[PDB]
Amino acid sequence: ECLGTIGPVTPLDASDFALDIRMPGVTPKESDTYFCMSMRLPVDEEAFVIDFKPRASMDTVHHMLLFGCNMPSSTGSYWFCDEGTCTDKANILYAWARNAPPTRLPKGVGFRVGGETGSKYFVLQVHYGDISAFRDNHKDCSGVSVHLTRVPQPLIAGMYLMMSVDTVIPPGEKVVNADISCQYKMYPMHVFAYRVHTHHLGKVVSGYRVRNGQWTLIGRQNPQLPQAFYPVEHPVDVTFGDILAARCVFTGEGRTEATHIGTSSDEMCNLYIMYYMEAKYALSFMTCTKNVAPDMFRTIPAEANIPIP
């Protein structure tokens, strides 16, 4: 342990405590290695994550992810995240890039963990991007501190994940569109941040809320930037009756054969939409894996198609 003697649980006032989540002194051998560790919640009952503080090496940490899950992919001290992250759904809670904004939780908003439904584990992913072979051993203890409370929060945060699966990229087609769309049928969620995931053929990912045929932008981004959470300037209310619809733009230029949307020889079109909902009607995760309203896309705004290099 990098000499740090901070302690894995720190009590705060009565109902709160901080959870130092830190790599157990690891040593990366190639630039672009993703290391993973897990931390169990110390409480069995329900708690609320209400804040984070990055503790990343200035000199080499590129990216950090924190997820919430019940079954991490390993039980050893640490592992290579290529192996997996969680065996079950890895529910993303926090993201950090060097020089990207970190996006703070709004006041009164907490992620729900523990209890019957809540994630039992945190898994931390630290991407090292920039390494010298003279570092010998080094020993890095990068991670994050997390502020938890058992004071029930009034708004609860969650992740609405949009995923594409029925789309293929014929090689050399300059522009290929992957569209996603599901009906919204829960209580109101209010969208306040978003992240976009795609492999290297992705050009731009956009996400919208369509209400009575009018599209409101949730967020838009080139997915080859640092894949952190970008804040929504004004949070978008999404409501029973509305449709959520995204739109991944790919290229097949330079490619030999058809690329699919399913490993790193595939592609992916993921849009991670981070929301809050009033506590009594809330849920921590939702997913769309379909395109139920494909014809609607002929009327999608023109900004959805314009590149962001």
Residue numbers in the entry: 46 to 307, 309 to 355
Q: What does the original paper state about this entry?
A:
Two enzymes, peptidylglycine α-hydroxylating monooxygenase (PHM; EC 1.14.17.3) and peptidyl-α-hydroxyglycine α-amidating lyase (PAL; EC 4.3.2.5) working sequentially are the only proteins known to catalyze this reaction. PHM, a two Cu enzyme, catalyzes the stereospecific hydroxylation of the glycine Cα of peptidylglycine substrates.
To determine whether copper at both sites is required to bind peptide substrate, crystals of apo-PHM were both soaked and co-crystallized in mother liquor containing N-Ac-di-I-YG. This peptide binds to wild-type holo-PHM in both the oxidized and the reduced forms. In contrast, the structure of apo-PHM determined with data collected from the N-Ac-di-I-YG soaked or co-crystallized crystals showed no additional density corresponding to the bound peptide, indicating that copper at both sites is required not only for the later steps of the catalysis but also for binding substrate.
